Amino acid sequence: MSSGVMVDPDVQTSFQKLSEGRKEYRYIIFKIDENKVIVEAAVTQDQLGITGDDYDDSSKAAFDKFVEDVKSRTDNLTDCRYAVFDFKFTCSRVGAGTSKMDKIIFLQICPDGASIKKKMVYASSAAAIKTSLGTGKILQFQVSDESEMSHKELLNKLGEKYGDH
């Protein structure tokens, strides 16, 4: 655990082209390998067959089936990774109605009933990945089940944070 998790330089690079580039399009898939964070994929959903925007376009249907794929490919729930999406949802404006809002979230998945050794490495990673990005303003939530990382909950979390909770 006290191994000293570091980040692969390309991690920050992938965050640049999102934050100051595509904004809400094409996301970053990065896991822990050995003892440092690796970029597995810098892929959008709109290049694989979907259109892109979670609620704005209603591409959330993609996220709805993805949670099943998660339990299908990873057997039980032994998956752990870092996933960052700038997802475009709609916030309920107090005094008004629906208002489209786009912003970035840190998805940290830490299953309690998962492989503690490699999983606890992700706990060390939380410090490294955030410090390397120095965002200062982010919503970094800790989920463990597929249903917690579903599109409805994602919208809910990023809404309740400064909205109705």
Coordinates of C-alpha atoms in Angstrom, one line a residue:
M1 CA 0.0 0.0 0.0
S2 CA 2.8 2.4 1.0
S3 CA 4.2 1.7 -2.4
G4 CA 3.8 5.3 -3.6
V5 CA 1.4 5.3 -6.4
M6 CA 2.3 7.7 -9.3
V7 CA 0.6 8.7 -12.5
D8 CA 1.6 8.0 -16.1
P9 CA 2.3 11.4 -17.7
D10 CA -0.2 10.7 -20.5
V11 CA -3.0 10.8 -17.8
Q12 CA -2.7 14.5 -17.4
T13 CA -2.4 14.9 -21.2
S14 CA -5.7 13.1 -21.7
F15 CA -7.3 15.4 -19.1
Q16 CA -6.0 18.5 -21.0
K17 CA -7.8 17.8 -24.3
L18 CA -11.0 17.2 -22.4
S19 CA -11.0 20.2 -20.0
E20 CA -9.7 22.8 -22.4
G21 CA -10.7 21.0 -25.6
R22 CA -13.6 18.7 -26.2
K23 CA -15.2 19.7 -22.9
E24 CA -18.0 17.1 -22.6
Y25 CA -16.8 14.8 -25.4
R26 CA -14.4 11.8 -25.5
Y27 CA -13.5 10.5 -22.0
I28 CA -10.6 9.0 -20.1
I29 CA -10.3 5.4 -18.9
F30 CA -7.4 4.9 -16.6
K31 CA -6.7 2.0 -14.2
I32 CA -3.9 1.0 -11.8
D33 CA -1.2 -1.2 -13.2
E34 CA 1.5 -2.5 -10.9
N35 CA 1.9 0.7 -8.9
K36 CA 1.0 3.6 -11.2
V37 CA -2.0 4.9 -13.1
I38 CA -2.3 3.9 -16.7
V39 CA -4.4 5.3 -19.5
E40 CA -6.2 2.3 -21.1
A41 CA -8.4 4.4 -23.4
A42 CA -9.3 7.9 -24.4
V43 CA -12.6 7.1 -26.0
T44 CA -15.9 8.7 -26.4
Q45 CA -19.2 6.9 -26.6
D46 CA -20.1 8.8 -29.8
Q47 CA -17.4 7.1 -31.7
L48 CA -18.5 3.6 -30.7
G49 CA -22.1 4.0 -31.8
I50 CA -23.8 6.4 -29.3
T51 CA -24.4 10.1 -29.9
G52 CA -22.7 11.5 -26.8
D53 CA -24.5 13.8 -24.3
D54 CA -26.0 11.8 -21.4
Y55 CA -29.2 13.7 -20.9
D56 CA -28.9 16.5 -23.4
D57 CA -28.9 13.9 -26.2
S58 CA -30.3 11.1 -24.0
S59 CA -27.2 8.9 -24.5
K60 CA -27.6 7.8 -20.9
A61 CA -29.2 4.6 -22.3
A62 CA -25.5 3.7 -23.0
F63 CA -24.6 4.0 -19.3
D64 CA -27.7 2.0 -18.4
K65 CA -26.5 -1.1 -20.2
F66 CA -22.8 -0.5 -19.3
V67 CA -23.5 -1.3 -15.7
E68 CA -24.6 -4.8 -16.8
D69 CA -21.5 -5.2 -18.9
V70 CA -19.6 -4.3 -15.7
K71 CA -21.0 -7.3 -13.8
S72 CA -20.8 -9.5 -16.8
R73 CA -17.1 -9.0 -17.6
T74 CA -15.9 -8.6 -14.1
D75 CA -17.8 -11.6 -12.7
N76 CA -18.8 -10.4 -9.3
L77 CA -17.9 -6.8 -8.6
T78 CA -14.1 -7.1 -8.4
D79 CA -13.6 -4.1 -10.7
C80 CA -11.8 -1.0 -9.6
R81 CA -10.6 1.9 -11.8
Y82 CA -10.6 5.6 -12.2
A83 CA -13.1 7.0 -14.6
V84 CA -13.6 10.7 -15.5
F85 CA -16.5 11.9 -17.5
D86 CA -17.7 15.4 -18.2
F87 CA -21.3 14.5 -18.5
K88 CA -24.0 16.8 -19.8
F89 CA -27.1 16.6 -17.7
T90 CA -30.0 18.8 -16.7
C91 CA -30.2 20.6 -13.4
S92 CA -33.4 21.6 -11.8
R93 CA -33.2 25.4 -11.4
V94 CA -34.9 26.5 -8.2
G95 CA -37.5 29.0 -9.4
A96 CA -37.4 27.6 -13.0
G97 CA -37.5 24.3 -14.8
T98 CA -35.0 22.2 -16.7
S99 CA -31.6 23.7 -17.4
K100 CA -28.8 21.9 -19.3
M101 CA -25.5 21.7 -17.4
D102 CA -22.2 20.1 -18.4
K103 CA -19.4 19.2 -15.9
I104 CA -16.7 16.8 -14.9
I105 CA -16.9 14.1 -12.2
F106 CA -14.3 11.8 -10.7
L107 CA -15.7 8.3 -10.6
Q108 CA -13.8 6.3 -7.9
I109 CA -15.1 2.7 -7.6
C110 CA -14.0 1.0 -4.4
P111 CA -15.9 -2.2 -3.8
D112 CA -15.5 -3.1 -0.2
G113 CA -15.8 -6.8 -1.1
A114 CA -13.0 -6.5 -3.6
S115 CA -9.3 -7.4 -3.8
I116 CA -7.9 -5.3 -0.9
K117 CA -4.3 -5.4 -2.0
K118 CA -4.7 -3.8 -5.5
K119 CA -7.8 -1.9 -4.4
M120 CA -6.1 -0.1 -1.5
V121 CA -3.6 1.0 -4.2
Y122 CA -6.5 3.1 -5.6
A123 CA -6.8 4.8 -2.2
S124 CA -3.2 6.0 -2.6
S125 CA -4.1 6.9 -6.2
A126 CA -6.8 9.3 -5.0
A127 CA -4.1 11.6 -3.5
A128 CA -1.8 11.3 -6.5
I129 CA -4.4 11.8 -9.4
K130 CA -6.0 14.8 -7.7
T131 CA -2.7 16.5 -6.8
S132 CA -1.4 15.9 -10.3
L133 CA -4.5 17.7 -11.8
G134 CA -4.8 20.4 -9.1
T135 CA -8.4 20.9 -10.2
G136 CA -9.6 22.3 -6.9
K137 CA -13.2 22.1 -8.0
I138 CA -14.4 18.5 -8.6
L139 CA -17.0 16.0 -7.5
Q140 CA -15.1 12.9 -6.6
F141 CA -17.6 10.2 -5.4
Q142 CA -16.8 6.8 -4.1
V143 CA -19.1 4.1 -5.5
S144 CA -18.9 0.3 -5.1
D145 CA -22.0 -1.0 -7.0
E146 CA -22.9 -0.7 -10.6
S147 CA -26.2 1.0 -9.7
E148 CA -24.3 3.7 -7.8
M149 CA -22.4 4.6 -11.0
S150 CA -25.5 4.6 -13.2
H151 CA -26.5 7.6 -15.3
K152 CA -29.4 8.6 -13.0
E153 CA -27.2 8.6 -9.9
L154 CA -24.5 10.5 -11.7
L155 CA -26.9 13.2 -12.6
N156 CA -28.3 13.0 -9.0
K157 CA -24.9 13.4 -7.4
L158 CA -23.8 16.3 -9.6
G159 CA -27.2 17.9 -9.0
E160 CA -27.5 17.4 -5.3
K161 CA -24.0 18.8 -4.6
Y162 CA -25.1 22.4 -5.0
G163 CA -28.7 21.8 -5.8
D164 CA -31.5 19.9 -4.1
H165 CA -30.2 17.2 -1.8

